[PDB]
RNA sequence: GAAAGAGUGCGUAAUAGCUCACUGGUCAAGUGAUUGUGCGCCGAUAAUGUAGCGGGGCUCAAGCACACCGCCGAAGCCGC
């Protein structure tokens, strides 16, 4: 019958993708896909069987439009009047990792296994990034023709 | 006579003056006015928390209109 994973069946690649004038939502989709797995033909939606995502330069992300001012990011802290809110401006310098993160975080499922998969995801604002060891292979933003 | 309006606005409370509509000039090609529309702007404004895209995000469209090319999709139809 169909095929399903066994135990030692998963196996994982690591991916750095670079962010330098790269489109927020452009990026965080790709970076959600093969975070997810949906580029395995192995995919199977019961098991975290995606792969190792790096994202290099955090910082230079594109974001389009007039968004840098009037879009914002809400957190509400459980106390009465307790909502504040940072623009993606602010965010930016602030601490501007959680940025690209963030955008990923909405793109993967809300349930416990997206809890898992989001281990994968390895966000660096600068251009260099610890994970040398396991020969992460630059992944390029592309798009299938039809 | 070109340029002088029973004199256009300020202000002199009335005049005056500042000016203007209107002819002379060096300049160097456009310049001003409507009507039919396609998309947008403002008017815009409530009380637990974003809160009038389901979310992330989208103008490098993932928005809109017109053509075209595929596909997904039901216990519908077909196949056994
Ligand atoms: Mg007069
Ligand atoms: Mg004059
Ligand atoms: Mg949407
Ligand atoms: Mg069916
Ligand atoms: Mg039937």
Redesign the pocket.
């Known amino acids: 019958p169909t095929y399903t994973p066994k135990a030692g069946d998963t196996t994982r690649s690591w991916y750095v993708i670079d962010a330098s004038?790269?489109?927020?939502?452009?990026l965080?989709?790709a970076a959600?896909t093969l975070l997810r797995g949906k580029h395995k033909p192995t995919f199977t939606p019961n098991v975290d069987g995606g792969d190792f995502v790096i994202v290099i330069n955090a910082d230079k992300i594109?974001?389009?439009?007039?968004?840098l001012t009037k879009?914002?990011?809400?957190?509400?802290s459980?106390?009465?009047?307790?909502?504040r809110?940072r623009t993606?401006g602010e965010l930016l310098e602030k601490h501007p990792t959680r940025?690209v993160e963030?955008?990923?975080?909405?793109?993967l499922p809300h349930n416990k296994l997206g809890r898992q998969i989001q281990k994968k995801l390895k966000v660096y604002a600068g251009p260099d990034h610890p994970h040398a060891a396991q020969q992460p292979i630059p992944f390029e933003i592309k798009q299938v023709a039809?």
């Open positions: 004038d790269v489109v927020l939502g452009r965080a989709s959600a594109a974001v389009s439009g007039d968004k879009k914002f990011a809400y957190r509400h459980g106390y009465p009047g307790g909502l809110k993606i940025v963030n955008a990923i975080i909405g793109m039809q």
